[PDB]
């Protein structure tokens, strides 16, 4: 009611999906759910036409590194043949769009803006492009980012840093600095803890409770979008909703929903229950199954990634998909937008453990703390049927913020998947084990368990 908008910009190769559960965890303290707006913008270019500097002369090196080397050196040509001030003054007149709507939407003067990551820099350059939008901004939150630069003119900036190693020294010059040396990099940025701070910096008290909240109700209202994952472009197909059971198996005949996605889509389901999201994307035979845990309340802010040209990240794992063994084995991607870490340390203080069919795949050799593990990819590496988890799966070494396990999984019956987390708690899922030869399986987990 007497709350502004607040407009979150995710930093690179990221989406909406990092802000998910602190729009939940808004909204659960009273914001119309509505009041949390993202905006979404292609990571790849913005970085190579814009941040140029932070990608390879400063901050995301890694990236930079591997960019040679995920894209088509021809393909890389034409994104850097475009304008960076076309590029700017285009990218960030989309946000004045979105910026906008919100103050029409709430009757709010100003709104909140929250960047992650690149996010950060990209808000900073926003701010200070012109006096006319920087008169728009209430409060300006900068999540473990741009370090060593001034805080916009007038803007009460906070800027909240996490633990270094994850690849004091980081002030935000006249911003309040804040730090959370226990976490990582993108734990930091879907925390209960930076979502204590961020709200009470902006509203002048700490919120009743940090708890993703059940609604009172049947229903959950679910805005999604299947999405290219790090160009964030809007992806078509269709999308088949299934109710499951305590093993993955389709409740329902026919899918509760079913239609035809054309980037976002808005479904009305049932609150507590498990479900299975099976989407085709235009022009591939795969099958798509998305699982997650049941949403508890309104969720205007998932995403299912999609993966695509110019970097189609699922194409390294092809090799396999077109053995005949793939008939026999399932391939899975296992996601959480908070660290999987299986190294040892004090500070970040736990280790997290993942089992598929009994067997930790979260170990110190696949899930280091520098990979800063997001998305883990389970599939028999060579389809020989054998499990050499201590072998690293060298394709995937070249990907930011992910991993593989060479595990082969049956494709018989069902796939187990357990995780205890290092902040502690667990949660588990069984699914169906769909055959790699036609299937694609995505199981993500919850950033946090209470
Ligand atoms: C099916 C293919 C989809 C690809 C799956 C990859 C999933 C991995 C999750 C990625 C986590 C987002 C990282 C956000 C950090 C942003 C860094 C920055 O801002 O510079
Ligand atoms: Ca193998």
Same mark, same amino acid.
């Given at each position: ?8 910009? =995710? ?26 707006? /993202? ?7 913005? $970085?190579?036409?814009?941040? /140029? ?46 910026? *906008?709507?919100?103050? $029409?939407?709430?009757? @709010? ?17 926003? +701010? ?15 999540? *473990? ?45 879907? %925390?209960?803890? /930076? ?26 209202? +679910? ?6 994952? @790090? ?7 269709? #999308? ?28 009305? #389901? ?17 099958? !798509? ?25 699922? #194409?390294?794992? #092809? ?24 190294? !040892? ?6 280790? *997290? ?5 009994? +067997? ?11 990979? $800063? ?30 991993? $593989? ?5 049956? @494709?018989?019956?069902?796939? %187990? ?5 290092? /902040? ?12 790699? *030869?036609? =299937? ?7 950033? !946090?368990?209470?």
């Amino acid at each position: 009611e007497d709350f502004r908008p607040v407009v979150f910009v =995710h930093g690179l190769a990221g989406s909406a999906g990092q802000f998910e559960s602190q729009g939940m965890r808004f909204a659960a303290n009273g914001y119309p759910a509505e009041y949390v707006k /993202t905006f979404e913008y292609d990571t790849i270019s913005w $970085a190579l036409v814009v941040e /140029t500097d932070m990608l390879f002369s400063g901050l995301g090196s890694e990236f930079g590194l591997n960019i040679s080397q995920i894209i088509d050196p021809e393909t890389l040509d034409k994104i850097l043949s475009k304008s960076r001030e076309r590029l700017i003054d285009e990218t960030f007149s989309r946000l004045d769009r979105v910026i *906008d709507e919100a103050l $029409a939407e709430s009757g @709010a003067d100003k709104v909140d803006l929250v960047g992650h990551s690149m996010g950060t820099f990209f808000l900073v350059r926003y +701010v200070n492009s012109s006096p006319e939008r920087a008169a728009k901004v209430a409060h300006l939150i900068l999540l *473990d980012g741009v370090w060593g630069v001034d805080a916009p003119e007038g803007i009460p900036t906070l800027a909240v840093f996490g633990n270094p190693k994850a690849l004091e020294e980081k002030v935000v010059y006249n911003a309040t600095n804040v730090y959370f040396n226990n976490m990582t990099h993108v734990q930091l940025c879907t %925390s209960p803890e /930076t979502f204590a701070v961020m709200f009470e910096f902006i509203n002048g008290y700490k919120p009743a409770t940090t708890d993703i909240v059940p609604q009172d109700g049947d229903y959950v209202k +679910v805005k999604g979008k299947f999405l290219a994952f @790090a160009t964030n472009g809007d992806v078509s197909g269709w #999308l088949s909703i299934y109710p499951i059971d305590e093993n993955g198996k389709r409740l329902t005949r026919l899918p509760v929903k079913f239609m035809r996605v054309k980037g976002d889509f808005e479904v009305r #389901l049932r609150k507590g229950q498990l479900y299975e999201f099976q989407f085709r994307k235009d022009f591939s035979p795969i099958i !798509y199954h998305y699982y997650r845990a049941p949403f508890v309340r309104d969720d205007l802010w998932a995403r299912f990634l999609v993966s695509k040209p110019p970097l189609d990240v699922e #194409l390294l794992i #092809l090799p396999e998909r077109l053995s005949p063994a793939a008939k026999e084995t399932s391939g899975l991607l296992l996601i959480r937008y908070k660290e999987m870490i299986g190294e !040892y340390d004090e500070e970040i203080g736990g280790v *997290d453990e993942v089992y598929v069919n009994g +067997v930790n795949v979260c170990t110190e050799r696949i899930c280091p703390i520098e990979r $800063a593990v997001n998305g883990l990819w389970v599939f028999d590496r060579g389809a020989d049927g054998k499990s050499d988890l201590d072998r690293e799966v060298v394709r995937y070494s070249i990907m930011p913020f992910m991993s $593989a396990a060479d595990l082969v999984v049956p @494709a018989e019956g069902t796939i %187990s998947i357990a995780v205890k987390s290092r /902040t502690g708690g667990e949660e588990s899922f069984t699914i169906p084990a769909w055959s790699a *030869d036609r =299937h694609s399986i995505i199981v993500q987990f919850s950033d !946090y368990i209470v």
